[PDB]
Amino acid sequence: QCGLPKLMALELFKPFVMKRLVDLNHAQNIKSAKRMVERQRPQVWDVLEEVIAEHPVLLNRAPTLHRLGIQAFEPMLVEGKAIQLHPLVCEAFNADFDGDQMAVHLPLSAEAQAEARILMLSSNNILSPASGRPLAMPRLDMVTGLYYLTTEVPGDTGEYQPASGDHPETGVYSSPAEAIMAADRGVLSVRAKIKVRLTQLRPPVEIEAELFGHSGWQPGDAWMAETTLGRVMFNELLPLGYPFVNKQMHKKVQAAIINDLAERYPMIVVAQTVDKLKDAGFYWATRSGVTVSMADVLVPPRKKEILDHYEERADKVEKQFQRGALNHDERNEALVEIWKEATDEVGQALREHYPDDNPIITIVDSGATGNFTQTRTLAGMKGLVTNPKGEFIPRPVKSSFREGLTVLEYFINTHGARKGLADTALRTADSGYLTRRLVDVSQDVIVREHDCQTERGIVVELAERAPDGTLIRDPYIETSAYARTLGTDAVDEAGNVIVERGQDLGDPEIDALLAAGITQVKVRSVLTCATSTGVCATCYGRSMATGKLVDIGEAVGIVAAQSIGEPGTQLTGGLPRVQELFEARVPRGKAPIADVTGRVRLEDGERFYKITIVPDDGGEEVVYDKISKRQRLRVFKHEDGSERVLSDGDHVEVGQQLMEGSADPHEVLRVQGPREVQIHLVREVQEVYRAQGVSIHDKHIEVIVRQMLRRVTIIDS
Amino acid sequence: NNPLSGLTHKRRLSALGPGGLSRERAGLEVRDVHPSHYGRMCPIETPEGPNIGLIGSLSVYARVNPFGFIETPYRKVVDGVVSDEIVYLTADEEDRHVVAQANSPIDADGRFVEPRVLVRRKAGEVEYVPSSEVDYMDVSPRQMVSVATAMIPFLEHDDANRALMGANMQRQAVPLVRSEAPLVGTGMELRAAIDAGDVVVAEESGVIEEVSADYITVMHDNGTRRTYRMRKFARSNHGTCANQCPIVDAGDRVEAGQVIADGPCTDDGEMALGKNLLVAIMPWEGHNYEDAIILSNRLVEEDVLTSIHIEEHEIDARDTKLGAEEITRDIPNISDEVLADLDERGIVRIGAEVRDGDILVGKVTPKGETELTPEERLLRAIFGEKAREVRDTSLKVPHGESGKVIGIRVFSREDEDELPAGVNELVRVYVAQKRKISDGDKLAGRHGNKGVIGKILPVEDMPFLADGTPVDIILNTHGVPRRMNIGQILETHLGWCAHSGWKVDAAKGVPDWAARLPDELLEAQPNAIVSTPVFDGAQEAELQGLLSCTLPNRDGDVLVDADGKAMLFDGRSGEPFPYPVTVGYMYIMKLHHLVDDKIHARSTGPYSMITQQPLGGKAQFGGQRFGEMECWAMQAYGAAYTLQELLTIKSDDTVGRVKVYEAIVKGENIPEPGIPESFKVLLKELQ
Amino acid sequence: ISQRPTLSEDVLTDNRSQFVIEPLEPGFGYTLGNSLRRTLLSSIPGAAVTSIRIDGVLHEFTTVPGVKEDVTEIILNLKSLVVSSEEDEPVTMYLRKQGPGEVTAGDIVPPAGVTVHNPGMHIATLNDKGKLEVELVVERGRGYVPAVQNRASGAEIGRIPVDSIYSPVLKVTYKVDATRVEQRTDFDKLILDVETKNSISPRDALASAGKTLVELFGLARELN
Amino acid sequence: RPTLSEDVLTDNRSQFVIEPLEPGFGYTLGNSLRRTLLSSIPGAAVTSIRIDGVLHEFTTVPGVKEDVTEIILNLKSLVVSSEEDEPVTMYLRKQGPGEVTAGDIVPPAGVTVHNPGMHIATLNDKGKLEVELVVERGRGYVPAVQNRASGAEIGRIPVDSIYSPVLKVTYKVDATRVEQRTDFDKLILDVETKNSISPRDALASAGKTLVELFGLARELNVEAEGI
Amino acid sequence: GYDTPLGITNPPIDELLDRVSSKYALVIYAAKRARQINDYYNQLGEGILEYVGPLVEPGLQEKPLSIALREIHADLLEHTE
Amino acid sequence: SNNSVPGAPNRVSFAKLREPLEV
Amino acid sequence: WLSAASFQETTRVLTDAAINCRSDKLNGLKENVIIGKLIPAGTGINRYRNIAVQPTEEARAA
DNA sequence: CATCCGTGAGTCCAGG
Ligand SMILES: [Mg+2]
Ligand SMILES: [Zn+2]
Prior knowledge:
It is classed as transcription/dna/rna. Keywords: RNA polymerase complex, transcription, DNA, RNA, TRANSCRIPTION-DNA-RNA complex. The structure is cut from a larger assembly and holds two copies of chain A, two copies of chain B, two copies of chain C and one copy of chain E. Chain B is α+β, with helices and mostly antiparallel strands. Helices cover 16% and strands 25% of the residues of chain B. Chain B starts with a helix and ends with a helix. Helices cover 17% and strands 38% of the residues of chain C. In chain C, strands 3, 5, 6, 8, 11 and 13 form a six-stranded antiparallel beta sheet that branches. In chain C, strands 1-2-16-15 form a four-stranded antiparallel beta sheet. The chains are: A alpha+beta, B alpha+beta, C alpha+beta, E mainly alpha. The structure holds one DNA strand.
């Protein structure tokens, strides 16, 4: 739903209202019907109430960085001149209420309304098409409200007490109905650990087996649990049929719950469930007692003690440079380190000195919002400020904002703060341009077929091999494997096949492959499947939105562009690297790669690096010329020790990066071929978004990259 | 918008303009804060937009020397001794010297306290320097800031980002029906209002010989009389209400330079940009989520956040080729009900109320003698009514506008009023609106803490203190520590102490915290005004102390604690809130972003002359734009029909939009869209 | 484990009176006084001015020759006027004063059944040659009814509709003494506090509050 | 327009809808009516109990499946109406294999058990069970520490007394659009009672109860109101 | 199992999606039939042989889309691509 | 007092004495 | 050339296209949006576009 | 591998 202004609707449905005015005879013709609306006669408010019946409208909020920037809603008439908005689409629109305006469009044609209610409606697009994560989830107050009641308070009143002496067991209730009458009298805390028999909530998977033998739990069967009354009120939302959760609701926790519901349970369940979660938070965020006073924001006790230790370490460095024993480039480089360390020790001072009661911390540690760095700047200290150049200033802002910054301190911060906004303004114009390019290079990319049918896919590193033993989950797992569909049966050591070909990878199917011990799977990709125009549904796989197989006709190309461009603002390599990759420029680093695989011959000179390579298989020595400013890349050798820098006598594969920097993908093409260059790009692109904490599925990058290699040059006519 | 807004406008420093640079020509070096700006150009005041760093405000004590550079006052230090002799220095001249920060401790004679003091040096570099080597010192701690920046209490507690907005936004405040001076101030509130020129100051000393709402007459000592005429309900450039009221009572003895009558956003000669509001820092049932704001209906029932807004409407009667336009009360095919509020001329009568659609000035023009419809010819023989050659060209009230007609200004070419060539009668109709604050109106404090009004609850629903007093405004706790602007908090504390009053304990001497506190503040009345000058004023120690000194209410009970919080009762449930809530008084401004202006919608309307697309803007009753980015959003969805319909029958299909209207009003099906006239234009532009 | 019909004591002060109620159910006192507080502030009947008319004035935004305040500040002063009328139908007051001097709520001429309760209220400062002739309309009602409603009726262009704050209640609250001692001695003692506008008594206020609530909860007792 | 009273049903519980309330009264009526049903209605429940084969709690009763704990809880859920205010005593004895229920309970005069099919304890062979029950009358909810001296100190066990015949109540307040005003409040109320009394009745007593209180205020003047 | 779908979430789209190849297909499926119903109501006024009227009971002032979308749920309609 | 120069309301200031020159 | 022209360097695109006498088959997203044809994606493709919906034979007028 | 001309440099709103 959305709150559409009574005044706004009347002009939007203007010829629609005029229709029913001459219908029900309020006006004799269509001309008079107009005059009735323009005069805002009392009748029309009754009329319009009927006209907008379940007739969806569009909510747009600029800038539209991805397709969820336009969503359809069921319009609800409202007194006042503002548009009322649901607190869960705030994440999708990036919309706050510091004066934002949204545009409304009224679909007219029969198919238009159909496209609205079905494709675009907010209660259907709960997931991000970029990562498949829940965007319409508890966000600020909500999470802080849920995180409240689901917390376990040790010595809180009404807590379960064992029997001893002449008094029996205190803190055991017959039912949730009883425990509710307890906190209403004032005996029981909603956050204190207790024991309660439950009748309408399926127990954990681990306990249901123990208590029923998986006889199939039923609404009415009893069982005993050790939670807090609050955590019970929270599970009455998920609701029945869903395994009870006995945790405190941090954002990451709640995020899992919905993502699970996104998989198993149907769409209308999630929409209803997440709504219930919203009401819950708000009611409990109110009674959460999260408040900011000068009192709650406390300066550390070791404030002047810690700062006097490092200012002393500083003056030592000043005098060591006063005697000119230190280089100038070295002096600051050390001064930076001293004050970087100091700020960390101030933060530590806070966390422990701060009670987990403390609202400033309650908000930060609970993922509701805010960084601890912010909290550090507030009550600890600001720390290092950035130079116009970007380098970190040797002088530190020792003052917190609570203590009030000195005049000279405020000035230089301000310089930093402004230059901050300036670049923030320039990258947007950069990101928005990179985005529009990506959009154009991949428009004719559509899901045209249900399946390419080729067995071609690509290898994915499911997990790393632990030196001690066992297996370690690969970090890239979520972005490079999880949404893919298999192209080759995945077999363990035995002849036993774990997952078939033509099978979507899910969460448990990764758990099946992980426990089986297999650490590499071949998966179908957009890079490999070949079809006349665009791609095929089978290779793409699971549409991050739907959580099911991508529909035939999806404009996956544009959405891929949107997915990559939408978060391109949050960088510092940096965004230029993304451009330099997608535009396939001969890079800045220009780190060489070995033409032929063989034994490395390091022959360094102080005036110049020179690298020679003796061909493993016969061959003639191939020698390069490197500038000493770069350094040799610590490649993972056969020794399984990655931290080994390049040394003479080492063995490199073909195309192996010799030194640190970036490799020319044009050489990677002529050296390692069309396939390998696509995989180089995708992960070099990914590595950039990795650093700034942005997770885009490899899928989307591949769509763009695919459109870079669709042409081949003409050597001979 | 308000006097300050104008004042700052006169002191803007733009780099843009001819002979200057362009907005695209400017890189990142021109915009960021330079070291030489110290005391000359504020580092905080600048636009948030793409114009950032290209427009600035001139610092408070700064001035311009005959060669167009910016000088600044510094105190002269002979040999470790501060001298009251002051010399202005240009930028590069201060570079050849060494300046001590203003707050460096000084002997009662004038000598420094420590040998090594804080020192400013060329290239914005700072180092401790022996007192032998101090050349000058800063005039004031607030020397670097601008007029607007200095009106931000506890500025040194707010990160530059929100502080910036907090300065930019004060110039957006709207004059309220009557205005209160802020309980917390910085001192600047006085001089800003006087210098602004939108108040009334007495030239020569004397005594108020006669006072009226209309004017003030002052009997000088020399015998001469100067009368000051009051500006009363005048329309500013931005449709805010510049209304001046007399301060002095008849027979008051008044001296020269004193404020005898203040104007919009001015209380007793001080900048009254807003109202003092009883705040409560708590999430409240989600209605304040993501920076929205909750209000007590008291603010609506007591006009506390209510303003006046005047619009000016124009219409003229020209000579046409078919005759001349004449303004008359005789308009074709209109009842005597719609005409009821006009005069014999055709003009609306003063004091009448107007809604949108209604007629302000009845003007008719002769229409071209083209052959009327054979279908309407026939319709004129039946009813036997002969058509008039005059088409209705009246001035009706624009959509959204409404109010009382507060003044008519008529110019005639007949009454020798010199008009431009071709014009005959020219009418202006002024309408004032008494806009009470509503949902969607944008409120802000001085700390960049903005936000629109989310919900206005009944006065009873409002969380209230033990003595029954309902709070005024419910801010969301969530959006405070993130913005680094705890100045809003500190103000709230000092706000409460100033509302209730206080008294330090002098028994067993003067306490060690209030040792630095000036004598005058050791005892404070209820509703007392105070100053917290930037880079001076209240310190967190004293503020913590004053919270304990808080005087009890009329019932003899203290209301808030030493933490600054207090116990609330949920006006809805009745049960008290579990945890103490930070309560206090905070100064809030009503910014000029009110829904009554901002709301807009259109079904069909006017269309582009060339592209045949809709026109743009509220002023033109145009439609919204469905941009390149927005189309991507459609395609990504795959809503092909929606997307098409918007780009076709909703836009520039000449024949389509007409037939879509028919299909809707006849209740049929929507037709298949035609060819975009825009695309046709393109092929003609290619050809 | 005890039964006692409740009491309703009273400790007075001229404008404001505390009402004591005991013995009540445990944890019941709070949400009991609150139900009253919300009854009082919102739906207690009273009376106040709806519209006015001034000689020489055609709308709210002008000045009368010789008077210190503009009509807007004059209409804004008149908001704090405390009036009690018995006439269920609307009645017309009057105020006319000339020459030098101050004008007040006293100089208002209330008709049959209308009583002003704050004559010392400042309205305007009429300077020499200042003449002020006003005509005030008083109605009965409850709560808050905005000015804007009057103008659309059929009101002539002379009249200047004014907002109407009918609620003769000023400030209300409560506190509760709950005996939580582990025994059957656990009860709650309610202390209500009401302050009025000297238009009606704090007792009469609570009376009309109870008369309202009784007619509300009575629907919970009627059978289907 | 005068306000209506509606009902949507279920055997043990039902939802009530009140509308249209004068704007801002939904909350004026809400929490007050809930705390009334939950606390201001008298019933009968178990204050204390006594078991034969028990000298301390941790050990289970000889011959019984359930722990000492899980029996108390089953017994708290027992619904009973006593006619006399003063504390009565009922006996429940049963031996051998099978299951003991609330129909096995031996009740005094004017004392009725309303769910004789309620499971209590699964006894096995050679399993003896003799229990003395202490039934009082009261209102709302009373802790166990406050009943720590209501039986013979040869195995007297204090129990959480759930006197209230109303189990759980929640309420929401949406808005109804009367005339042109969308302000009016609509009150929705969910009420679940024991097997003793119908919810439809529990409201009428809760309703009549509150009418008494507001009598006190009204008594002074009965000035003005309209319905 | 869930709470009763209110307004435009009814009929529950998951059950709707079960009766169709993919999201996009459901759109044209419904709207084309919704056009039939609106054709029926206008044609009936002056011409026979219209498309078959609403196969379910029309709610009071129910939009043609809402009618069609409900009967899809009732499996009363046939699906050709 | 802060600005005791025009005839203005007395606004009490937390301060270090600022007498160099008026705005 | 339509897609290219509306992308960047429009004068460059047009000169070339007019010299190579390039015909444009209006079969693309950008290409279609310009002329106002249903985009070849989503509900635009023939697969979904040409649908016949009919009442079941079992369903019959009362 | 470094120069000279030509082409790019987020969206929506607003106003004069
Ligand atoms: Mg925003
Ligand atoms: Zn494929």
